[PDB]
Design a protein around this ligand. Structure first.
Ligand SMILES: C=C1CC[C@@H]2C(C)(C)CCC[C@@]2(C)[C@@H]1CC/C(C)=C/COP(=O)(O)OP(=O)(O)O
Ligand SMILES: C=C1CC[C@@H]2C(C)(C)CCC[C@@]2(C)[C@@H]1CC/C(C)=C/COP(=O)(O)OP(=O)(O)O
Lengths: 260, 263
């Protein structure tokens, strides 16, 4: 599959989601192509064991649809694209992997049914449902926020959705994240790359704003930038000290620079 | 409960086998240790029938106090350069690997470590203590190494290890059979561990070796450093409270974490 075929396949499915915008499909495919391209070499290697082809169109489009779903949900929250009633119904459906009870959101059932069918290790599917609920809640709790930088960063780590991205990749290509999750070190890296992602976004409510409202005289911009530097170094140190199975090393690095 | 001065003397007797050990190390260890044991005493009484570990066992108590004195002494070895870099490295090897120290003047290390191994209710806790000892050691040196200054993030991550709460909890679990090795399998438990440790680190830096306050002030002179940290400390406390509520950890973990927050 090239690019517009993927974009159109994501867009076609998006028509079954009220509030879906073209950009949700376009940016999901662009970000998704970026990640898959950076981990391709590592993937084809594991392809021997799993039997999951890096170029499998079905797997690629499903991965892109999950990314589009994440972008769409974020806008639904930040921009009120759909009603609060609709959002609650959609989040309930996506979090349990069942059809939405309200009309105009058939895409939820389609995507989740697909993920269940394609899950290499079904434990990743349950984990994805879990990450979806966490994500939904972090978007809501953050929108409704008095917040300390610590609490902000803790919630932001879940609202950035990197955990969901990793879990979807594991689900489709059999990357055994369900097993790697048991290692405290892996969990640590997950938190760091996510915080990196959250800071990069807030810098590019939001961190900068939150700290400015509270500390008018604080160089919040440089501070937050040092924080980003700080987290990146800690990520590297742990990446070395620990040795994660392909394609996790290139994947984590890919996520760190997705600011391209 | 062994009398205070009798415990101090027992800690001091062992401490005499560590170059640079000072009376203060034993005295402060017994004071902090008694504070902790008194606050979790009712709980330990409750688990004693199951474990066979008596809250008033002098051997267990003195051993816990000696580990606390060890941590105080190590902090000073770094902070005041009581021993040479070569001697500190050898001490870290013995305490972090559980082997005899290759250099003379530190017999107390292998002695305390051997007692802990022998006394461990669940031997996993001993290996955990060795791990926590390595983290604590590395953190003391990293902090002291702190030129290119650390980010607040890097500081707190390191201060979480340098505060030694993990070590204290692990030693308690080893001695009184508190099943920390199993509880550590729960993500929520590991989170409260990082939380209570960050809390202890912030409180220490504010109340009264790189310091959070002097750190943020040298890099961000204009920012209201102290105000910020006090806000971050309240933030960690709120997070801790909610997790402790959501999750209902077996006794004595609730009282133990509560006691550390107030110490
Ligand atoms: C919109 C996005 C497209 C997909 C893309 C991938 C490929 C997953 C790589 C990471 C970035 C991204 C998810 C990208 C951005 C997603 C999104 C709009 C983030 C907005 O912030 P978020 O963490 O959702 O919380 P908040 O609502 O912004 O507070
Ligand atoms: C490890 C120590 C022994 C036990 C003691 C109790 C009894 C729990 C009371 C709280 C302190 C402590 C945990 C104590 C801590 C030793 C130590 C000096 C903690 C401060 O961190 P440290 O590594 O010294 O870095 P810094 O010098 O504060 O920058």
């Amino acid at each position: 599959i090239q690019t517009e075929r993927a974009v159109q396949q994501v867009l076609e499915w998006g028509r079954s989601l009220t509030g879906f915008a073209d950009e949700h499909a376009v940016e999901a495919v662009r970000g998704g192509q970026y990640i898959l391209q950076r981990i391709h070499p590592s993937l084809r290697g594991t392809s021997a064991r799993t039997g999951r082809d890096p170029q499998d169109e079905t797997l690629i489009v499903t991965f892109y649809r999950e990314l589009a779903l994440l972008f769409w949900l974020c806008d639904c929250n930040d921009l009120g694209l759909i009603s609060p009633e609709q959002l609650a119904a959609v989040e309930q459906a996506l979090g349990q992997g069942v059809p939405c009870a309200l009309p105009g959101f058939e895409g939820c059932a389609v995507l989740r049914a697909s993920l269940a069918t394609l899950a290499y290790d079904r434990r990743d599917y349950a984990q994805l449902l879990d990450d979806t609920r966490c994500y939904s809640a972090a978007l809501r709790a953050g929108h409704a926020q008095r917040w300390s930088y610590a609490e902000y960063l803790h919630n932001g780590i879940d609202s950035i959705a990197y955990a969901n991205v990793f879990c979807c990749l594991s689900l489709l290509w059999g990357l055994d994240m369900a097993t790697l999750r048991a290692r405290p070190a892996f969990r640590q890296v997950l938190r760091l790359i996510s915080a990196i992602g959250r800071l990069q976004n807030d810098l590019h409510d939001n961190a900068v704003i939150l700290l400015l409202q509270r500390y008018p005289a604080m160089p919040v911009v440089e501070f937050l930038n040092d924080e980003l530097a700080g987290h990146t170094r800690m990520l590297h140190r742990v990446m070395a000290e620990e040795r994660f199975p392909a394609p996790w090393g290139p994947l984590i690095e890919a996520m760190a620079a997705i600011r391209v």
